[PDB]
């Protein structure tokens, strides 16, 4: 499928945070458009409200807490307990610490080792456990929490370097 | 579906161009990692070669002719004539001048035009060709010409503004 040299549609998936609703007057009625707050912001990304299909995040976790998720899940150098015990004991605690950042840890942790290593039946379980918090905590109140599992899945399977 | 204040997730798409595939030894199998350039490159993702979904685009475009695309389709302030027959002849040669980035200027203009004022019969049809030549001219040698053809589409409709 791929080989060096190759060059492809990479999707930069990352927060944005809707800071104005401009409204026109089209075709006589009422029309919306979006100014986006994107890359902390170093990007306004202006679009039609109607041709908008971008899943939304509870305001809870917000904009930096979203980007925060995706640079948990794409942090390239982790560490995590070499023995079984240790490893799933600091994870079970994670799951229940309330914070979304180390829930993310989990769901990171647990998909890299699926890849590599594979998992423990228990390992298998968590990392479903985890998923369903990681997304129960930023889907807003079926298939967006189906897209965002997508999505951070994906994000956790990539390894993200800066170099500016 | 929106309101100020709100936060979603933005995909924000560009070219990305493998510098490297390097392989690790994995249950026994060899399995590919792919490092991939990213924005410029200010990013460097690495991630698993089987868990890539990211759709091709031909080397005679290549990464910058891509990023050069996204440019052209996501451009805030453009200029188009006023009357009918000047813009149709203006993009009648854009067409056929066998420069993608003008190919890209009609997808984009008459992607706008549809949303705001609506399409006279021959600009509804030449938006369509337009769209299948941009499409044929970047994607590798039909659900990659689908997927590529609803990217570029939702950029086209886009204004980038950039300030670092």
């Given at each position: 499928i791929?080989?060096?040299?190759?060059?492809?549609?990479?999707?930069?998936?990352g927060a944005?945070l809707?800071?104005?609703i401009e409204?026109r007057?089209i075709k006589?009625?009422?029309?919306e458009?979006?100014?986006?707050?994107?890359a902390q912001?170093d990007?306004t990304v202006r679009?039609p409200?109607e041709?908008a299909?971008?899943v939304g995040?509870?305001?809870?976790?917000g904009?930096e807490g979203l980007?925060?998720?995706?640079q948990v899940?794409?942090?390239?150098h982790?560490?995590?307990?070499?023995n079984?015990?240790?490893?799933?004991?600091?994870?079970?605690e994670?799951?229940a610490?309330?914070?979304?950042?180390?829930?993310?840890?989990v769901?990171?942790?647990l998909w890299?080792?699926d890849?590599?290593?594979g998992?423990?039946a228990?390992?298998?379980?968590?990392?479903?456990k985890?998923r369903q918090?990681?997304?129960?905590?930023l889907?807003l109140?079926?298939?967006?929490?189906?897209?965002?599992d997508?999505?951070?899945?994906?994000?956790?399977?990539?390894h993200?370097?800066?170099?500016?």
């Amino acid at each position: 499928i791929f080989k060096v040299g190759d060059t492809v549609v990479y999707p930069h998936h990352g927060a944005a945070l809707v800071e104005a609703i401009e409204t026109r007057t089209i075709k006589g009625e009422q029309k919306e458009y979006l100014v986006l707050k994107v890359a902390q912001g170093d990007l306004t990304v202006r679009v039609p409200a109607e041709n908008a299909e971008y899943v939304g995040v509870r305001d809870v976790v917000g904009q930096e807490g979203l980007d925060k998720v995706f640079q948990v899940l794409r942090a390239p150098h982790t560490e995590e307990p070499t023995n079984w015990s240790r490893r799933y004991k600091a994870n079970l605690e994670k799951l229940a610490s309330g914070d979304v950042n180390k829930v993310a840890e989990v769901v990171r942790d647990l998909w890299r080792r699926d890849q590599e290593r594979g998992l423990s039946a228990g390992e298998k379980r968590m990392l479903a456990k985890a998923r369903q918090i990681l997304v129960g905590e930023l889907a807003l109140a079926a298939k967006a929490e189906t897209i965002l599992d997508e999505v951070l899945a994906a994000a956790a399977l990539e390894h993200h370097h800066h170099h500016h």
